[PDB]
Design a protein around this nucleic acid. Structure first.
Ligand code: MG
Ligand code: MG
Ligand code: MG
Ligand code: MG
Ligand code: MG
Ligand code: MG
Ligand code: ZN
Lengths: 92, 196
RNA sequence: UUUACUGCAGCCUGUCGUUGGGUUGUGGUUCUGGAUGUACAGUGUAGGUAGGAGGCAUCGAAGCGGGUGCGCCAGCAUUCGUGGAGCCGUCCUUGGGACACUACCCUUCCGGGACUACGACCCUAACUCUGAGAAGAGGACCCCGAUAGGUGGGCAGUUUG
RNA sequence: CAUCUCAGUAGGAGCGGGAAAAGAAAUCAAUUGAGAUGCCGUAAGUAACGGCGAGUGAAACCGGCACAGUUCAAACCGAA
């Protein structure tokens, strides 16, 4: 499915309808200084690690298209609950 | 400055690999390896360390060099059921330090004496060496000495075996006061060994 | 029982310690003799950016030999010599930078001297094996402690609705 | 069920007395204070930990019992 790259919608911050650009959200790398990373390193020893020796699960048949809507005026983005599509493109 | 020669001995042993003690170390380790487990010596190798630890040049005070192996608690893999946390033992070093092991072996060699203190005197890839100061509580010279006649009391017998030396108290978590000593003082056993 | 899950021994291997001395081969560490720097033409080599102008000299300044630093066999450095005036620019050789002998730390200069991480070789002196020992054979390896990854139904905790 | 729990329990080895251990701050506090240790009460199932599950789990302050302080190494002297 296609969505326009730019369309006019509501900005929650400026509280008006402005043009907004849609940007796909990329998942970031997990920090090594978060409390869960420190806990994993602390629970690392001899033997089973508990939840830190779990193997990651499966995947749903289609993931949601993680989109972020940045207002062109205030340059602030907001993200809304998103649809679930096999193939996603931007309408240009 | 006017510093005592004990200060010069202390300085020489501060960074031993950078002083003349390195060559003495190279020559001495051959002799020390030739020796056994618990060797008596006429004088302490490091006189200043022994004197600050309580050594005196008098009858009833014995100094011994003890040889202890390196690494942690040489442990056997269990041959019955364990839960994978108690199965692994290679990385499990003990809770008994090498210095306190040396003190207890010295005490075992000398049943009539009491361990006073000990200090590090060398090490190589396979051994560490400590010199242990021992006192004869039944010698009249020690009995007269008012800085040492406390060792003639009934509670001073078996000091090293009950963790009452400086190394033992370091191993019991009682080297400091305040925070972190909740489960260590007055004893490890008093808190169900949860400290240490 | 196994190519079930999760671990643990054993074993393989890197790194650190044990662990020293020499020989070279690899990086800059650290700096002496030169500021070696130059589209166009130059009386002249920006003598690093410059008090935008102002010092020396027969008690030294050149057109020359393979041109000692260098380089377009020009010319700054007075040098083994012999020839008998290089300026500074308000005539700026209408400037990638236009220029006073004024403490040059700076793309070079290869005495790279001195410590250094990797690698190769040698030595013995630690260390190892043999012997009662003289000593013989190995040798900074191996063993060993620690740590890192692997392999691992040898073992052992379970799961297998 | 694997971390966890059971639990530093059971069991083991060594030492050891009428008690033992601890014990005179490189402490605890907080804007400025207290003043060795032990034991009891409380803080409090709180803070903290934890397939943040099941569970595990303090201390200080404060109120008491009882109160106690000191000895070396060194500087200076040099066998006194
Ligand atoms: Mg023995
Ligand atoms: Mg006591
Ligand atoms: Mg099995
Ligand atoms: Mg079970
Ligand atoms: Mg004490
Ligand atoms: Mg517990
Ligand atoms: Zn907006």
């Amino acid at each position: 499915m296609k969505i326009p790259k730019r369309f006019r919608t509501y900005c929650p911050f400026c509280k008006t309808h402005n043009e907004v650009v849609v940007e796909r959200v990329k998942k970031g790398q997990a920090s090594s200084m978060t409390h869960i990373a420190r806990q994993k390193k602390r629970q690392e020893g001899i033997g089973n690690s508990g939840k830190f020796s779990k193997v990651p699960g499966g995947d749903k048949p289609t993931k949601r298209i993680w989109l972020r809507y940045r207002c062109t005026v205030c340059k602030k983005a907001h993200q809304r609950p998103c649809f679930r599509a096999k193939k996603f493109e931007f309408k240009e | 400055m006017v510093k005592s020669f004990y200060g010069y001995v202390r300085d020489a042993w501060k960074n031993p690999d950078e002083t003349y003690v390195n060559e003495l170390r190279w020559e001495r380790l051959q002799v020390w390896r030739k020796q056994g487990s618990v060797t008596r010596i006429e004088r302490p190798t490091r006189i200043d360390r022994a004197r600050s630890l309580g050594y005196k040049a008098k009858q009833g005070i014995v100094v011994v060099r003890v040889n202890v192996r390196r690494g942690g608690l040489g442990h056997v893999r269990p041959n019955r059921g364990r839960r994978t946390q108690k199965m692994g033992k290679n990385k499990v070093s003990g809770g008994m330090s090498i210095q306190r092991i040396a003190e207890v072996r010295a005490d075992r060699r000398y049943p009539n004496l009491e361990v006073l203190n000990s200090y590090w005197v060398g090490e190589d890839g396979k051994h560490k060496w400590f010199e242990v100061i021992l006192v004869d509580p039944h010698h009249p010279v020690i009995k007269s000495d008012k800085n040492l006649n406390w060792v003639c009391d009934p509670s001073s017998r078996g000091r090293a075996t009950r963790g009452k030396t400086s190394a033992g108290r370091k191993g019991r978590g009682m080297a400091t006061r305040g925070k972190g000593t909740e489960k260590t003082r007055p004893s490890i056993r008093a808190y169900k060994s949860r400290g240490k």
